C-alpha cells in the first residue's frame, strides 16, 4: 500500500497548498501586479520634446513659463485689458506654452493635409507621442498591429476649429473627426493598428493620472498586454485663460508658485505626456526596457466640496491612502511625493494638509514634496503624466529636482512637523537598500483626485555579459520622407557624437529592432564610429557614401535568383567561410554531401585562390567537373547564409545550374540529393567539352535569331540586351571579330561545353544513366520558377529528366524575371560570389513595368563579412524585409536609447477632352489625376503627392476618395466605379486605368 494516508493525504496537501500558492499569486497579479513604465514620451512647455530634454529643465531649475503663443493666431490684444472683468480678456500674462503644437507631419501617417488641418492639436501631438513612446521602448510602432494594446488618453474638449454648425471650406467632414476627445484615442489605435481598448478620459487636471489608472488595471486584469496611457492639454484657443480668469484663478504671471507665499493664482501651461505601461512580468519577459514601475494608482472624487472647483481635504487623503493600500505600501515607504501643487492660494494649503495626513502623520524621514507645475505650469490634463515622468527621471538620474518658486514656503501651511521637506534644492535620491518610491498626485477641477505610486525599476537589469564580434551589423535607419531620412541620420550622428562610446552592435540592434521600416531606407555597415559618423554625415546631406539608399514603399518579400558561371574568380568564399560560423558550416555540409559522389572536398580547393589556381595547367576554375561542384558548394552556402540572417525567399530563379540550388534551398531536394545531382550532371558534362563554347553578348535577340546557325544558337535570354548563345568553334570566334567593331562586345565566356542546345543530348545516355532515381522530387519550401518551361510550376517535377530538360532548351531568364515582376514580387537577390548579370534584370525592369531591385551578396575579390554587412545593407535599402532579430539573435547586443523619428513638421493650423494624340496624353491624364488628387487632399502645394504611395496612406478616405472620383467623372467625364479607390490603390494605377478606359 501507499503508507496509508501518510503518503497520500500528504500528497494531496502538496497540491492543495501548491495550488493555493498559485491561486494566491493570481490574486496578487489581478490586484497588485506592478506595471512597468516601458517608455516615456513628452512634449512639455519650453523646449521639451523628449523625457531627456525635460531632465535638462528639471535638473538645472528652469521655468518653462515664457509667454503666450504667437503662432496660433490668438488675438493677444483683446486678451488683455486693465478691466479684470472685461468679457474676453485673460489674466495670466504668459505660461508654459508649446512652440510645436502648431506644426505636424501629416503625410507621415495616413492623414491628408486637409484632414490634418482639422485634427485637434491635442490628438495631432498624441499621434507623434504614440510613435515616440514606441520608438523609445524598442518596439517597432508598426509591429503593434492587430495587437491587444490599449490607448488611454486624457484630454479636455476645448475649442479648435470653426464651430461645426458653420462647417468649413476644406475641413468639412473632418472637422468632427478633429474636435472629438473620442477619436483622440481611436486615431492613435488606428494609425498604429492597436486592437486594445482605446478609451479617452475627461477629469480635467487629473485626466492623465486617471488614464494611467485605467491602463494599470487593464494590465492587472489582462484585457490589454500593453497600454499607452497619457494625457494632453494643448489649448488652441485662449478660451480657457478667458474662463479660468473670470473665476479669478489664473496667476497673473502664468507661473504655478507651488506651496509658496507668493501664490497669486494657479497659473497655466499646455503640454502632453504618454507612458508605455506593461505589467512587469510581461515587460521583463518580452525584454521591454523598464524605467520605473507603477505599483498602485487610486482614483477618488472630492465629493460635496466647497463648490465644484474647490478641493476637498479628506477625499485627497483617502486617495493618497488608497493608492498606498492598493500598492501594498505604507506612508513611510514613499521617499518623495510629486504633488499637484496647482499653485492656488487655497488649493495648496488643503493639498499639503492632505500630504501631512496621509504621509506626514507617520514619517521616518522628511517627505520630499515637489511639483512639476513650478518648472512647467499647470499642464491640466497633461499634469499627472508630467509628474510620473519627473518622478521616473528623478529615479533614473538619482536626484529629485527642485520645485521652483518655493523658497518662501507657504505661511498658510503648518510645516512645523518637518515630515514634509519642500524640494527647493535638488536633494540626492540615490539607489539604496530601500526601493525608491514616489507618489504623483493630480487633483482635477472636476473634483476627481488621483494618486499613483511609482517604485524604481527593480534593479535586476544588472547581470549583463560582455563580448566582441566581427559581425558588422547594418545600421539601418528609415523614414517616411527623403528629408526625414536626412534628419534621422543627422539626429543619430548628433546622438552618437553627444552620447559617445555606445557599442556599434548596440546601435545596430536598436536602430533595427525598435525602429519601424518606413518607406525611405538607408543602411550602412560601419566598421568604426568615425566611418559611421562620416556616413551619418553624408546621409544627412543626401550623399550616399559607404551606404545604400532606397525608396522602397510596397516592398516586403524578396526572391532568390541564382546566377551561373561568371565568378571564375571563386576566391571570395574563403574570406566569408573564415569569418562566418554559418558559411564555415553550410559549406562543410554541402561539401561532405558532394564528396560521396565527387571526391573533391571544396575547402582545400577553397584556400587555393586563383593566384594559386593556375600553376598545374589550370585557369580560374575552368574545370567543369571541379567548378560546378564547388560553384554549388558556394551557392547553397550563400543561400543558407542569407536565410540565416533573416531573408527568406519568395520565388526562386536559377540560370543554368542554379536549378540545383533551387532544388536544395527550396526544399525540393536535400543537401545530399542536390549535391549528388550536380556532382553527377558534372561528370557527364565533363565528357563533351573540347568543341563547344558559350558566348554572352548584348547582341539583339531578334537579330541573333537569324545568326542562329553554325551550331551556335541561344542558350539563355538573360535580359533584353543579354543573350547567352552556345555552339561550336564555327561562329564562336568570328562573332567577336565581326561584332566588336560596331560597339557590340562579345563576352566569350571562358567555358568549354555547350548547354541548352542539341549538344547536351549527345550525353543523354550517360545523363540518364549517371543521375539515377534516388533524389526523389519532393514538394519543398519555396515557390520556384522553371528556366526550361519558363513558368511558375510545382516543386515535384525536379527529377533526372528535369535536369536534362533544363540543359536542353533556352533558359529564358528574362521571361522568368518579368513573370516575377508581373506576378507580385519585385526584388531579387543574386545569390553568388560575384553578381554577374546584375544590370541584366535591371535592364529587364528599365524597359518593362517598374525598375526592379538588384541586390547582391558578394563581388569579384570581395568576400569579407564587411561586404556581407553591405549586402544586408543594400537588401534592406532596396525593400527586402530582412528580419533583424536573426542578424542580432546573438551578438552581445542590448537596447540603447536613440533619437526618435524626426517628424518633418509643417504649420497646420485651423483658425476659428484629350483626343488620343500620343503618350503625351498618358502623362497629361497622369498630371490631371494627380492635380485633382492634390486638391481633394488639401495639398495647397499642388506640386507633388508621392506617386508610389497608396490611396490609404495619403489620407484618401471616403470624403477625399469620393470627391476625387467625382472630380475625375467631370474633368475626364467618365463613370468611375464606386470602389475605384480600392480598385486602383495608387495614383499610378488610377491614371493608367483612366487612360486605358478610352473606349
Amino acid at each position: 500500500m501507499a503508507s496509508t494516508d501518510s503518503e497520500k493525504v500528504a500528497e494531496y496537501l502538496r497540491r492543495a497548498t501548491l495550488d493555493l500558492r498559485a491561486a494566491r499569486q493570481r490574486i496578487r497579479e489581478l490586484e497588485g501586479e506592478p506595471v512597468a513604465v516601458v517608455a516615456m514620451a513628452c512634449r512639455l512647455p519650453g523646449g521639451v520634446s523628449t523625457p531627456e530634454e525635460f531632465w535638462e529643465l528639471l535638473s538645472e531649475g528652469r521655468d518653462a513659463v515664457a509667454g503666450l503663443p504667437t503662432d496660433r493666431g490668438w488675438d493677444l490684444d483683446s486678451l488683455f485689458h486693465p478691466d479684470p472683468t472685461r468679457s474676453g480678456t485673460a489674466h495670466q500674462r504668459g505660461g508654459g506654452f508649446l512652440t510645436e503644437a502648431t506644426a505636424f507631419d501629416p503625410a507621415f501617417f495616413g492623414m491628408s493635409p486637409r484632414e490634418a488641418l482639422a485634427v485637434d492639436p491635442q490628438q495631432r501631438l498624441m499621434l507623434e507621442l504614440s510613435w515616440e513612446v514606441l520608438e523609445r521602448a524598442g518596439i517597432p510602432p508598426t509591429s503593434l498591429q492587430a495587437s491587444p494594446t490599449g490607448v488611454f488618453v486624457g484630454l479636455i474638449p476645448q475649442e479648435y476649429g470653426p464651430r461645426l454648425a458653420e462647417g468649413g471650406e476644406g475641413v468639412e467632414g473632418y472637422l468632427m473627426t478633429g474636435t472629438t476627445t473620442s477619436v483622440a484615442s481611436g486615431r492613435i489605435a488606428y494609425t498604429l493598428g492597436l486592437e486594445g481598448p482605446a478609451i479617452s478620459v475627461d477629469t480635467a487636471c487629473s485626466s492623465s493620472l486617471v488614464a494611467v489608472h485605467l491602463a494599470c488595471q487593464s494590465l492587472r486584469r489582462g484585457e490589454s498586454s500593453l497600454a499607452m496611457a497619457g494625457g494632453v492639454t494643448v489649448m488652441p484657443t485662449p478660451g480657457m485663460l478667458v474662463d479660468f480668469s473670470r473665476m479669478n484663478s489664473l496667476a497673473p504671471d502664468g507661473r504655478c508658485k507651488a506651496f509658496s507665499a507668493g501664490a497669486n493664482g494657479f497659473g497655466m501651461a499646455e503640454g502632453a505626456g504618454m507612458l508605455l505601461l506593461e505589467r512587469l512580468s510581461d515587460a521583463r519577459r518580452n525584454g521591454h526596457p523598464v524605467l520605473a514601475v507603477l505599483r498602485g494608482t487610486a482614483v477618488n472624487s472630492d465629493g460635496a466640496s466647497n463648490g465644484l472647483s474647490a478641493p476637498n481635504g479628506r477625499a485627497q487623503v483617502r486617495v493618497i491612502q488608497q493608492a498606498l493600500a492598493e500598492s501594498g505600501l505604507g506612508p513611510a515607504d514613499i521617499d518623495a511625493v510629486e504633488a499637484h501643487g496647482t499653485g492656488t492660494r487655497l488649493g495648496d494649503p488643503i493639498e499639503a494638509r492632505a500630504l501631512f495626513e496621509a504621509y506626514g502623520r507617520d514619517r521616518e524621514q522628511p517627505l520630499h514634496l515637489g511639483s512639476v507645475k513650478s518648472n512647467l505650469g499647470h499642464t491640466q490634463a497633461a499634469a499627472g503624466v508630467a509628474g510620473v515622468i519627473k518622478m521616473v527621471l528623478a529615479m533614473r538620474a538619482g536626484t529629485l529636482p527642485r520645485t521652483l518658486h518655493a523658497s518662501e514656503r507657504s505661511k498658510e501651511i503648518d510645516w512645523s512637523s518637518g515630515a514634509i521637506s519642500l524640494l527647493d534644492e535638488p536633494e540626492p535620491w540615490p539607489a539604496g537598500a530601500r526601493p525608491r518610491r514616489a507618489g504623483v498626485s493630480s487633483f482635477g477641477i472636476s473634483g476627481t483626485n488621483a494618486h499613483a505610486i511609482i517604485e524604481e525599476a527593480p534593479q535586476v537589469v544588472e547581470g549583463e555579459r560582455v563580448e566582441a564580434g566581427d559581425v558588422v551589423a547594418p545600421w539601418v535607419l528609415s523614414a517616411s520622407s527623403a528629408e526625414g531620412l536626412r534628419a534621422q541620420a543627422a539626429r543619430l550622428a548628433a546622438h552618437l557624437r553627444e552620447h559617445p562610446g555606445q557599442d556599434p552592435r548596440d546601435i545596430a540592434y536598436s536602430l533595427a529592432t525598435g525602429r519601424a521600416a518606413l518607406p525611405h531606407r538607408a543602411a550602412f555597415a560601419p566598421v568604426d564610429e568615425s566611418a559611421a559618423l562620416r556616413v551619418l554625415d553624408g546621409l544627412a546631406t543626401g550623399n550616399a557614401d559607404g551606404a545604400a539608399v532606397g525608396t522602397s514603399r510596397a516592398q516586403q518579400r524578396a526572391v532568390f535568383v541564382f546566377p551561373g558561371q561568371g565568378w571564375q574568380w571563386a576566391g571570395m568564399a574563403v574570406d566569408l567561410l573564415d569569418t562566418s560560423p554559418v558559411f564555415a558550416a553550410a559549406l562543410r555540409e554541402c561539401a561532405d554531401a558532394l564528396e560521396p559522389h565527387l571526391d573533391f572536398e571544396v575547402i582545400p580547393f577553397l584556400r587555393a585562390e586563383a593566384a594559386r589556381r593556375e600553376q598545374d595547367a589550370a585557369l580560374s576554375t575552368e574545370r567543369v567537373d571541379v567548378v560546378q561542384p564547388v560553384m554549388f558548394a558556394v551557392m547553397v552556402s550563400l543561400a543558407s547564409m542569407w536565410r540565416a540572417h533573416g531573408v527568406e525567399p519568395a520565388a526562386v530563379i536559377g540560370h543554368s545550374q542554379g536549378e540545383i540550388a533551387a532544388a536544395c534551398v527550396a526544399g525540393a531536394l536535400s543537401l545530399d540529393d542536390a549535391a549528388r545531382v550536380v556532382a553527377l550532371r558534372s561528370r557527364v558534362i565533363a565528357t563533351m567539352p573540347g568543341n563547344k563554347g558559350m558566348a554572352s553578348i548584348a547582341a539583339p535577340a531578334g537579330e541573333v535569331r537569324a545568326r542562329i546557325g553554325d551550331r551556335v544558337e541561344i542558350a539563355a535570354v538573360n535580359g533584353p540586351r543579354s543573350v547567352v548563345v552556345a555552339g561550336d568553334s564555327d561562329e564562336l570566334d568570328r562573332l567577336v571579330a565581326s561584332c566588336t567593331t560596331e560597339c557590340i562586345r562579345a563576352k566569350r565566356l571562358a567555358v568549354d561545353y555547350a548547354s541548352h542546345s542539341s549538344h547536351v543530348e549527345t550525353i543523354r545516355d550517360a545523363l540518364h544513366a549517371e543521375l539515377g532515381e534516388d533524389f526523389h522530387p519532393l514538394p519543398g519550401f519555396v515557390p520556384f520558377f522553371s528556366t526550361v518551361t519558363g513558368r511558375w510550376t510545382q516543386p515535384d517535377e525536379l527529377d533526372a529528366g528535369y535536369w536534362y530538360r533544363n540543359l536542353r532548351r533556352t533558359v529564358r531568364f528574362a521571361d522568368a524575371v518579368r513573370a516575377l515582376a508581373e506576378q507580385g514580387y519585385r526584388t531579387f537577390l543574386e545569390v553568388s560570389a560575384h553578381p554577374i548579370l546584375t544590370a541584366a534584370i535591371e535592364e529587364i525592369g528599365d524597359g518593362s513595368g517598374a525598375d526592379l531591385s538588384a541586390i547582391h551578396s558578394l563581388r569579384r575579390g570581395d568576400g569579407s563579412l564587411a561586404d556581407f554587412g553591405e549586402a544586408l545593407s543594400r537588401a534592406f535599402a532596396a525593400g527586402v524585409a530582412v528580419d533583424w532579430e536573426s542578424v542580432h539573435l546573438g551578438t552581445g547586443a542590448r537596447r540603447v536609447p536613440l533619437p526618435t523619428y524626426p517628424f518633418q513638421r509643417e504649420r497646420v493650423w485651423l483658425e476659428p477632352l484629350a483626343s488620343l494624340p500620343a503618350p503625351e496624353r498618358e502623362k497629361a491624364l497622369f498630371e490631371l489625376v494627380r492635380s485633382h488628387a492634390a486638391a481633394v487632399l488639401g495639398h495647397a502645394s499642388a506640386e507633388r503627392v508621392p506617386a508610389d504611395q497608396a490611396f490609404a496612406e495619403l489620407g484618401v478616405d471616403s470624403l477625399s476618395a469620393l470627391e476625387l472620383r467625382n472630380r475625375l467623372g467631370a474633368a475626364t467625364g467618365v463613370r468611375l466605379p464606386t470602389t475605384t479607390v480600392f480598385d486602383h490603390p495608387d495614383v499610378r494605377t488610377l491614371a493608367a486605368h483612366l487612360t486605358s478606359e478610352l473606349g
Partner: antibody
Amino acid sequence: EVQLVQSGGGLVQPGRSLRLSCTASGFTFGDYAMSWVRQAPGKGLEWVGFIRSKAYGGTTEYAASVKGRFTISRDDSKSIAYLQMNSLKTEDTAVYYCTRGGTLFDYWGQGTLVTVSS
Amino acid sequence: DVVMTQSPLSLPVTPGEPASISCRSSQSLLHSNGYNYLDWYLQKPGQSPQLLIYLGSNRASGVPDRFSGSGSGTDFTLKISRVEAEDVGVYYCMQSLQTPRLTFGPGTKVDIKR
C-alpha cells in the same frame, strides 16, 4: 516553474536492458514519491511503479506485471528519477511516462516511445 | 477487495454545450477525512495525461474553470460547463483509496458530437 523532461527511449529486442531518465526541474525532487506509468499503443494507462520520497524512506512499489524485472531509483544531488528496465519482452513496446506522485500523478513527462520489437 | 470504477465510456460532446462524465465505484471512496479519494485525469489525444481534479471536487491549478467536480465517492460526476476543442480525449476516473492501481480504468472516450 515545474517540468519533468524525460529521456531514454529507443529500439531493443526482447531480453535486453534500457534506461529511463526523468529530469525534474522546478520542484524539490526529494519531496514527491515519483511514479512511472506506461501507455501501451492506443490503450489505457497502466501504472508500472513508483519510488517513495527519500525523506519518507518507504520502498519501491512495482506492478505485478514487471516485478523482478524493472527497478526504480531516484537521486536528489543529481535530481533524476530512473526506470531501469531489464529482461524486456514484447509487452514493453509502449510510451512510458514519469509522473510526480505516487497516488496523485499531478505532473507528467512527454512520454518515451520505448519499443521492444524483434 | 479492489475498487471497480466505471464511467460512460463513449460519451459524445458538442462544442459550447455543457457535458457530464460520471464515475461509479463499487466500494466507498469517501475516506474518514470527509474527503473523497477520486481523481479525474485527462489525456488529450497524443499528449501527456493531465490532472484535472483531485479529491473528487478540487480542481488542479492550470485547469480551466470549465472542469467542475460534483457528487459522492461512490457516484461522481465531472461537469464540464463549456466543452471546447480542448475538452476532448480520454477522461480517466482514477481512485486513490487503494494503491496498488494497475490501471487507470477504460477511460471515457470523448468525441466531438454530430
